[PDB]
Design an enzyme around this catalytic site. Structure first.
Site, PDB file in Angstrom:
ATOM      1  N   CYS A  92       8.875  -4.890  -3.382  1.00 21.67           N
ATOM      2  CA  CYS A  92       8.225  -3.792  -2.651  1.00 21.67           C
ATOM      3  C   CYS A  92       9.038  -2.488  -2.819  1.00 21.67           C
ATOM      4  CB  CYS A  92       8.112  -4.176  -1.158  1.00 21.67           C
ATOM      5  SG  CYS A  92       7.177  -3.067  -0.097  1.00 21.67           S
ATOM      6  N   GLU A 143      -1.055  -5.073  -0.918  1.00 22.07           N
ATOM      7  CA  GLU A 143      -1.278  -3.659  -0.652  1.00 22.07           C
ATOM      8  C   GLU A 143      -2.107  -3.545   0.618  1.00 22.07           C
ATOM      9  OE1 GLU A 143       0.560  -1.846  -2.281  1.00 22.07           O
ATOM     10  OE2 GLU A 143       0.823  -3.054  -4.083  1.00 22.07           O
TER      11      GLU A 143
HETATM   12 NI    NI Z   1       4.982  -2.997  -1.096  1.00 18.31          NI
END
Ligand code: NI
Length: 168
Positions: free
Chosen positions: A90, A133
């Site tokens: 991430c 997402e």
């Molecule tokens: Ni992410």
């Protein structure tokens, strides 16, 4: 323009996004800058809320040469099945990867950059990426799936990293 990406433990990462009321030229500029930011940061996906814009917009592109950019606005999960997991990274949790449980297949409905509706049945990396997402938009991070001890163990790491990072 390249937008700034928020990192943990920024509280704004935990905000729930509102749906887009109208897909217009301000929306389309957000899309453009999001794609720019994603590519600059070398991601394959970016949610609007990691860039402090709390609307339901996701950009993805898994392609090698930007042939297949993907835009989901007001995304909605119609169905899922199966289970899988790769070691996710991430952009908001810098340099930290963990295997995370996901559905293997996923069918969604969203709007494209022009505000026209489409359906998309996805599997493999794409399916995992859509889930990752979409989580961002309701304020969830992949570390939320892990044990208190891994999260705890994780959090220590990142703050140091950025603590290097401003560096000065
Ligand atoms: Ni992410």
């Amino acid at each position: 323009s390249v937008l700034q990406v928020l990192h943990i433990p920024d509280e704004r990462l935990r905000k729930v996004a509102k749906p887009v009321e109208e897909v217009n030229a301000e929306i389309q500029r957000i899309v453009d800058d999001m794609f720019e930011t994603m590519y600059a940061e070398e991601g394959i996906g970016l949610a609007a809320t990691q860039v402090d814009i709390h609307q339901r917009i996701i950009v993805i592109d898994v392609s090698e040469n930007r042939d297949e950019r993907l835009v989901l606005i007001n995304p909605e999960l119609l169905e899922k099945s199966g289970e899988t997991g790769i070691e996710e990274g991430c952009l908001s949790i810098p340099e930290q990867r963990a295997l995370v449980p996901r559905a293997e297949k996923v069918k969604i409905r969203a709007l494209d950059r022009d505000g026209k509706p489409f359906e998309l049945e996805a599997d493999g990396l794409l399916a995992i990426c859509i889930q990752h997402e979409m989580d961002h938009l309701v304020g969830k991070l992949f570390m939320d799936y892990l044990s208190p001890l891994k999260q705890q163990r994780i959090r220590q790491k990142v703050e140091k990293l950025d603590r290097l990072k401003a560096r000065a």
